[PDB]
């Protein structure tokens, strides 16, 4: 049978608990993550915006921007890839479906769609408002109905904690899973106990977003495991470090007129070749001919 | 008149001596380069291959992979971008021209094409051969002829020094310039005096590739100015540092079950927002509307 | 100065009265239009949806699908191209601007945005509602502000006549123009006198959509000139004819087991070659080289 | 199991004899072909060049141009799609592989790669020279080794008749199949008897290119069946008719200032809606919600 990246994502879930899922900004970093041992990786929507487009995460990126990053990554790295699909790239059910199908075809193992509103008017400032529960149930149903690969994962993310409180966020989660959501991503959780409540309310795996500088403390895998969390997500960790490292290089080069003093911060040429399996290419040729 | 990235590039050469040109792997890093004060940036061919595609620099990347990175970068960053165009993405004058016109429309300020032979047969193993002086002259002729913007830059890159000795290298350079080459990128120089020799032989600005872990010394901008070099290129510097920092994070997070111990290696959220001009978006809305 | 597709478009309006603008479904047809003598062409939104994607005109096509057709067309055909941008490909001023800047860089001469509401909820059924006059004014303001080429055209399209009656339609048009709209595309007019009324109310060129099988009569260029209309648009005309001819071939070939009986309905090989300037390629080679 | 378009292509081969495979210039025409009853369709390389890019078929199009046409078509039409992959879009085995994998991922059921040389020097005029037998065997092996879906079809096309005669073309064909080719495409065959000779020399299915104005007469499906031909190909038939129909529309509109006299040559609005299953969209919404 043909390989199903979703199938592999769900398998990796069965094998690791919690499953650590790391953000990979580009194909090169996906290889680095694969080498470090991860079993699943991630395409952050904020990273596509900030890193690939140099834009804030305000809904400016398009499906196309994300699709090309998904292909670049999955063309060279076989690890299953979870994709941040925002609110579906379009208001209509027709848009949600095209996004789902395009993403599966581009190579992704799954995606998460959230309940945010986006922008309602040309001058609508960036906001965290969320649609009604019903509206989100409709997005979820449209997305699930669109799965062309039964094993592709449709995860539902809720940002209801900040604007409606815990009990309402949990309640929405139960309705989302009821509508078809296969996994749950409760955003900005503040206490380990809350995760357990979500774990207990919905009988599907839950993801905990362990991002760098927000509302959620830096919970360990052991702590998350105790809270019955099925996945730990680090959406931009590598990216943040990469930026500081590049910045420092740019600054020193500009200040000193040579990079001599930051050489020791650099991945060597040999290391880079190892990372992209440079020599496995010479092998491919030897195996095929000459 | 309409803005010309090429003209601005030529203008940058007059404002700095030598002009520092730093490789920017993506849109985000082009902005960090601009905020660090640079007046010109670069899109490394090996960088597109290794970072964007996770592939070795063996001619697998296509024009389209490079175009995408050109647009992402130049759509948000106004600095003139010099692009590595390998041999023109195709063996025919028709390919060279389509490449030039496409790179211009995508937003580039200039590009360099080299006299490399490339892959001859399907089973061709990586080799360092160069086409005849006449053949490169034809490539250069096709490139200049295709310019749709008179100020766009056609730079010729030659690896003749390591292949045919100095004098022959200089003989090619003179013929390349006479063919219309507007700037020269001589590869593999290990002594300042040599740069002076190229500078003396051709009346076009010359570029010094100060990349790491190669045969060439880490010359300083002042040393370079003393040899009459017009621009100093640092093709993958920030990239090499970003990979190491990212790698370090993936490993530490995997071993420790938390990234807590490497937070101090990360660009802060405020630094992220500032780097991508986050605050200019709401300011834009207030300026346009009520 | 650098060539401006927008400027050339504005210049076309002065050379013809009214300016005939024909929809060109692809690069090939843009060239047939140019060889037929036209001085301006059009990229229909429904055309990109129906011909390029094989989808109904229900807002499924994205900015990226339209950009690809803009580049393919303008990369080879120098005629100014007017583009259907629906409502800006996004609900935020940030989307409108990214759309304008992208269409300009892709090669377009101008675009029109309309005051349609679009899909509100995921389950929204096709509807003909329009935003408030103020909301469209904001969209128009964001669009004009984003122009990177001063001569690029921002045309406002309104379906207010069929929704709110003539006077209200004219009231919106005046406000749209005051907001910076450079040309007007009033929908659903069935009488020449009405065009004259719009022309009289706003001091900007007005466009008459002479599409087939709709509520509007097949007005002639002379009738249109008598009503003060500056340009006559034929959005899908050649497209509708091409599909029928193609359909006829598929059916005849399937029934007969040979296309022999429909050869006389086909563009000859000489006509193909001439249409795509085939002979200019070898001429280019002889002109550049030995 | 997941759907394999190659599997469906091979199935359609088993069911029809000869299998009629029709060229579809865009997604819309793929739907028309599906409606006319075809069981397999085709993406002509000359059509991507002439129709999508408005360029002659001289190796100017890139893999990217073809990949976007493959996605557009297969995203909306489920018929299996045979793709013209020229010589593999790149000289290296690494290029042949990336093309094969990219095309499978984009949705294609199979492709054909030929033994032409392309351009050897910048000024190399368009030609029909072909590589040695060995060189083509290497391309074929690289392509087969790259199949990510065992059912994807790798067809080998030979243009050796025009430059080496029949016996040599047959001999190459035997070597190509020996190297891994799954089907054979002998170009520009002039007599029914020749096909039978190919059919007899290689024990894999053979395709007969029944194109519009070349060396091959317009053989019927019955005649081809008698020659043991497994597939009949009509690469541009629909496209040629579509062009004449569009041209006539452009001319009449320009000459008469109205399209009234060519209305009867147009596919109606209702027909277009039927063709793109416009109303099946209203059904999707009714099934999902509201």
Query: Could you tell me which of B241, B179, B186 has the C-alpha nearest to residue B208?
Result: B186
C contacts of D16 (beta carbons < 8 Å): none
State yes or no: C123 annotated in a binding site. Answer: yes
Query: Could you tell me which of C280, D120, D62 has the C-alpha nearest to residue B92?
Result: D120
Query: Could you tell me which of B29, B69, B85 has the C-alpha nearest to residue A72?
Result: B69
Name the residue of chain B whose CA is nearest to D138's CA: B122
| CB within 8 Å: D289 and A94 | no
C contacts of D240 (beta carbons < 8 Å): 266-267, 272
**Interatomic CA distance for residues C79 and D54, integer angstroms:** 14
The number of folded domains in chain D is 1
Enumerate neighbours of B (3 or more CB pairs within 8 A): A, C, D
Residue pairs between chains C and D whose CB atoms are closer than 8 Å: 255
| CB within 8 Å: D149 and A2 | yes
Q: Cis (ω within 30 of 0) for the bond into D18?
A: yes
Report angle CA A158, A221, A160 to the nearest 5 degrees: 10
What pairs with residue A130 in β-bridges?
A116
Sheet with D207-209, strands from edge to edge, namely: D183-186, D153-158, D110-114, D81-84, D41-43, D19-23, D231-234, D207-209
| CB within 8 Å: C96 and A142 | no
Answer yes or no: A209 catalytic. yes
Report angle CA A149, A153, A155 to the nearest 5 degrees: 145
| CB within 8 Å: C288 and B71 | no
* D272 and D57 Cβ atoms separated by less than 8 Å: no
| CB within 8 Å: D105 and A281 | no
Sequence-ordered alpha helix ranges (H) in chain A: 5-15, 27-35, 45-47, 63-76, 93-106, 133-146, 160-164, 166-179, 192-201, 221-226, 237-256, 269-275, 279-288
CATH of the domain at D218: 3.20.20.60
Q: Cis (ω within 30 of 0) for the bond into A263?
A: no
Give chain B's radius of gyration (CA, Å): 20
* B247 and A210 Cβ atoms separated by less than 8 Å: no
Helix (H) or strand (E) holding D111: strand D110-114
A contacts of B40 (beta carbons < 8 Å): none
* D186 and D169 Cβ atoms separated by less than 8 Å: yes
What pairs with residue B153 in β-bridges?
B110
Helix (H) or strand (E) holding A83: strand A81-84
Report how far apart, in Å, the C-alpha atoms of A278 and of each of A36, A241, B64, D94, D142 are. Answer: 18, 25, 22, 12, 18
* D142 and D181 Cβ atoms separated by less than 8 Å: no
Query: Could you tell me which of C241, B274, B119 has the C-alpha nearest to residue D118?
Result: B119
| CB within 8 Å: A289 and D93 | yes
CA dihedral angle for residue A74, residue A77, residue A78, residue A79, rounded to 10 degrees = -100
D contacts of C122 (beta carbons < 8 Å): 289
Instruction: Please identify which of the residues D16, D57, D151, D164 carries the catalytic annotation.
Output: D57
| CB within 8 Å: D91 and B121 | yes
**Interatomic CA distance for residues D57 and D78, integer angstroms:** 27
**Interatomic CA distance for residues D192 and D211, integer angstroms:** 15
Burial class (CB in 10 A: 0-12, 13-18, 19+), C163: middle
Interface of A with C (CB under 8 A): 58-60, 62-64, 89-96, 98, 118-124, 135, 138-139, 142
Residues of chain A by 3-state class (helix, strand, coil), percent to 5: 50, 15, 35
Residue matched to tokens 């260029």: C221
Report how far apart, in Å, the C-alpha atoms of B77 and of each of A52, C9, C11, C107, D278 are. Answer: 12, 28, 32, 19, 42
Interface of A with D (CB under 8 A): 1-4, 71, 75, 93-94, 98, 101-102, 105-107, 138, 141-142, 145, 148-149, 281, 284-285, 288-289
| CB within 8 Å: D72 and C53 | yes
Sequence-ordered alpha helix ranges (H) in chain D: 5-15, 27-35, 45-47, 63-76, 93-106, 133-146, 160-164, 166-179, 192-201, 221-226, 237-256, 269-275, 279-288
Answer yes or no: D209 catalytic. yes
Sheet with A41-43, strands from edge to edge, namely: A183-186, A153-158, A110-114, A81-84, A41-43, A19-23, A231-234, A207-209
**Interatomic CA distance for residues A208 and A219, integer angstroms:** 9
Answer yes or no: A77 catalytic. no
A136 CA: distance to closest CA in chain C (Å): 9
Backbone angles phi, psi at C130, to 5 degrees: -120, 150
Query: Could you tell me which of A163, A154, A164 has the C-alpha nearest to residue A185?
Result: A154
Query: Could you tell me which of C171, C101, C173 has the C-alpha nearest to residue C142?
Result: C101
| CB within 8 Å: C139 and A122 | yes
Is D39 strand, coil or helix?
coil
* B60 and B33 Cβ atoms separated by less than 8 Å: no
For residue C187, count other CB atoms closer than 10 A to its CB. Answer: 20
**Interatomic CA distance for residues C138 and C147, integer angstroms:** 15
* Token digits of residue C169: 């339609």
Specify whether the backbone of C134 is left (phi greater than 0), alpha (psi in -120 to 50) or beta: alpha
Query: Could you tell me which of A30, A120, A46 has the C-alpha nearest to residue A80?
Result: A30
Q: Could you say which of A64, A119, A142 has the minimum Cβ distance to residue C62?
A: A64
**Interatomic CA distance for residues B41 and A82, integer angstroms:** 33
CA D148 to chain centre: 20
* C157 and C112 Cβ atoms separated by less than 8 Å: yes
**Interatomic CA distance for residues A203 and A220, integer angstroms:** 23
Name the residue of chain C whose CA is nearest to D26's CA: C52
Binding residues of B: 44-46, 84, 86, 122-123, 157, 187, 209-211, 240, 269
DSSP string, chain B: ----HHHHHHHHHHHSSSEEEEE-SSHHHHHHHHHTT-S-EEE-HHHIIIIIS---SSS-S-HHHHHHHHHHHHHH--S-EEEE-TT-SSSSHHHHHHHHHHHHHHT-SEEEEE-B----STT------B--HHHHHHHHHHHHHH-SSTT-EEEEEE-HHHHHHHHHHHHHHHHHHHTT--EEEE----SHHHHHHHHHH-SS-BEEE--SSSSS----HHHHHHTT-SEEEESSHHHHHHHHHHHHHHHHHHHHSS-GGGGGGSPPHHHHHHHTTTHHHHHHHHHH--
Elucidation method: X-ray
The parent domain of residue B61 ranges over: 1-290
Residue D260 DSSP code? G
Backbone angles phi, psi at C117, to 5 degrees: -80, -50
Helix (H) or strand (E) holding D23: strand D19-23
C225 CA: distance to closest CA in chain A (Å): 36
* C28 and D47 Cβ atoms separated by less than 8 Å: no
Instruction: Please identify which of the residues B122, B125, B264, B282 carries the catalytic annotation.
Output: B122
Q: Cis (ω within 30 of 0) for the bond into A18?
A: yes
Answer yes or no: A256 catalytic. no
Q: Could you say which of D92, D121, D122 has the minimum Cβ distance to residue B119?
A: D92
| CB within 8 Å: D237 and C266 | yes
Residue D116 DSSP code? B
B contacts of C179 (beta carbons < 8 Å): none
In a mutational test of the B interface, the residue from A272, A281, A282 whose CB has the highest number of chain B CBs within 10 Å is: A272
**Interatomic CA distance for residues D278 and D36, integer angstroms:** 18
Say which residues have a Cβ less than 8 Å from residue D198's Cβ, sequence separation at least 6: D170, D173, D184, D186, D189, D206
Interface of B with D (CB under 8 A): 58-60, 62-64, 89-96, 98, 118-124, 135, 138-139, 142
Enumerate neighbours of A (3 or more CB pairs within 8 A): B, C, D
**Interatomic CA distance for residues A239 and A234, integer angstroms:** 10
Answer yes or no: D159 catalytic. no
Query: Could you tell me which of A252, A176, C223 has the C-alpha nearest to residue B20?
Result: A252
Sheet with C19-23, strands from edge to edge, namely: C183-186, C153-158, C110-114, C81-84, C41-43, C19-23, C231-234, C207-209
| CB within 8 Å: C2 and B101 | no
Answer yes or no: C286 catalytic. no
In a mutational test of the B interface, the residue from A250, A262, A273, A275 whose CB has the highest number of chain B CBs within 10 Å is: A250
| CB within 8 Å: D91 and B122 | yes
Name the residue of chain D whose CA is nearest to C22's CA: D250
Query: Could you tell me which of A84, A70, A77, A2 has the C-alpha nearest to residue A40?
Result: A77
**Interatomic CA distance for residues A263 and A243, integer angstroms:** 16
Q: Could you say which of D96, D98, D119 has the minimum Cβ distance to residue B122?
A: D96
Interface of C with A (CB under 8 A): 58-60, 62-64, 89-96, 98, 118-124, 135, 138-139, 142
Enumerate neighbours of D (3 or more CB pairs within 8 A): A, B, C
What pairs with residue B231 in β-bridges?
B19, B207
Answer yes or no: B112 catalytic. yes
């Amino acid at each position: 049978s043909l390989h199903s990246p979703g199938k592999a994502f769900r398998a990796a879930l069965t094998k690791e608990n919690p499953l650590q899922i790391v953000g990979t900004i580009n194909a090169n970093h996906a290889l680095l993550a694969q080498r470090a041992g991860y079993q699943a990786i991630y395409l952050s929507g904020g990273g596509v915006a900030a890193g690939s487009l140099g834009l804030p995460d305000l809904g400016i990126s398009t499906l196309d921007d994300v699709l090309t990053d998904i292909r670049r990554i999955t063309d060279v790295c076989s690890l299953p890839l979870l994709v941040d699909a925002d609110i579906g790239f379009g208001s209509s059910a027709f848009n949600v479906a095209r996004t789902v199908k395009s993403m599966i075809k581009a190579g992704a193992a799954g995606l998460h769609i959230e309940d945010q509103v986006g922008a309602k008017r040309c001058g609508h400032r960036p906001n965290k408002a969320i649609v009604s529960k019903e509206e989100m149930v409709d997005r979820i149903r449209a997305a699930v109905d669109a799965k062309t690969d039964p094993d592709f994962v449709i995860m539902a993310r809720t940002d209801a904690l900040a604007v409606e409180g815990l009990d309402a966020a949990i309640e929405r989660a139960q309705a989302y899973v009821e509508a078809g959501a296969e996994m749950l991503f409760p955003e900005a959780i503040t206490e380990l106990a809350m995760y357990r409540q979500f774990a207990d309310a919905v009988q599907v795996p839950i993801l905990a977003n362990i991002t760098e500088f927000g509302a959620t403390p830096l919970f360990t895998t052991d702590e998350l495991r105790s809270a019955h969390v099925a996945m730990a997500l680090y959406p931009l960790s590598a990216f943040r470090a990469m930026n500081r490292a590049a910045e420092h290089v740019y600054n020193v080069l500009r200040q000193e007129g040579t990079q001599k003093s930051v050489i020791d911060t650099m991945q060597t040429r040999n290391e880079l070749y190892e990372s992209i399996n440079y020599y496995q290419y010479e092998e491919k040729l030897d195996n095929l001919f000459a």
